[PDB]
Every structure is written in structure tokens, then in C-alpha cells.
Design a protein around this ligand. Structure first.
Ligand SMILES: CCCC(=O)OC[C@H](COP(=O)(O)O[C@@H]1[C@H](O)[C@H](O)[C@@H](OP(=O)(O)O)[C@H](OP(=O)(O)O)[C@H]1O)OC(=O)CCC
Length: 129
């Protein structure tokens, strides 16, 4: 069917020493799902997980569609040097009233070349299962 993709923007805010993760959307979600009508969220993790601050985030759940826009932004407190040791992991999970995640695939993103100035990179990432 193809690759399932997610669009993410990233931006460091050195004024406040925080890192923004913007989860924009999925395309070709049909490929990743066998079932129909499931509810889909994204699980974002900033790794390795430093216990000082919060490293695990979750989007709201939405009704699955081949394209699916979330536009959810998460802010993370972190010095730029800290940020540059981190890998970002985003997974596409299906979920039900059980509140159990079924993360069927996702991407990993080395954060060693996030810019410091402020221009936000927006890129597409292939999912892997
Ligand atoms: C209400 C929901 C919106 C939302 O959630 O958004 C989260 C906010 C605001 O994001 P945005 O402003 O919507 O982004 C704009 C559109 O996506 C558009 O695609 C593009 O125009 P084009 O490419 O079609 O021309 C614009 O480019 P310009 O040309 O203006 O530079 C771009 O700026 O960002 C953050 O949260 C920061 C976190 C890192």
C-alpha cells in the first residue's frame, strides 16, 4: 500500500529553554491499519528519559482516516545541550475504552541537529513496524 507517514515540526526556544514538538498529521494511515473505524492517537517520548522532567506525551484520540490531522503541540523543559543527546520517538497507537495502547509502528528522530535560533523544521517521517 505504501509507507505510513507522520508530519512533525520541531523548534527550540532558548529564551525559555524549552523544546516544542508539533504533531501535525498522518498520511496513508490505510497502509498501517488492517481494521477499520479504530481510534488513533500518537505517543511521543523524549529519550533517554531524564527523570527530572516529563518525557512521555500523548495526543488526543481521533477517528481513523487515511489522512488524519492532530495539530497538537507539546513543550518540554530542557537545556539545548541536553536536547542534543535525545532521540524523539513517535508511535501511532490505536486505543479503545480499555485505555490500552496498540502502537503499531512509529519513527525515531535523532535531535542532535535541532537548530538553536528558532526557525522550526517541518519534515515527514516514515513509520516502521
Ligand atoms: C489552530 C491549529 C493550528 C496549529 O495548531 O498550529 C500550531 C502553531 C501555528 O502553526 P501555523 O501558524 O498554523 O503554521 C502555518 C500553516 O501550517 C501553513 O501550512 C503555512 O502556510 P503555507 O505553507 O500553506 O503557505 C504557514 O507558513 P508561513 O508562510 O506563514 O510562514 C505556517 O506558519 O505553531 C506552533 O504551535 C509552534 C510549535 C512548534
Amino acid at each position: 500500500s505504501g509507507a505510513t507517514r507522520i508530519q512533525i515540526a520541531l523548534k527550540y526556544d532558548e529564551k525559555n529553554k524549552q523544546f516544542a514538538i508539533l504533531i501535525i498529521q498522518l498520511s496513508n494511515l490505510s497502509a498501517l491499519l488492517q481494521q477499520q473505524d479504530q481510534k488513533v492517537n500518537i505517543r511521543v517520548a523524549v529519550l533517554p528519559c531524564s527523570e527530572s522532567t516529563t518525557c512521555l506525551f500523548r495526543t488526543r484520540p481521533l477517528d481513523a482516516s487515511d489522512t488524519l490531522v492532530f495539530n497538537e503541540v507539546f513543550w518540554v523543559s530542557m537545556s539545548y545541550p541536553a536536547l542534543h543527546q535525545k532521540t524523539l520517538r513517535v508511535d501511532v497507537c490505536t486505543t479503545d475504552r480499555s485505555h490500552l495502547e496498540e502502537c503499531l509502528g512509529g519513527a525515531q528522530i535523532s535531535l542532535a541537529e535541532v537548530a538553536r535560533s528558532g526557525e522550526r523544521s517541518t519534515r515527514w517521517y516514515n513509520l516502521l513496524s
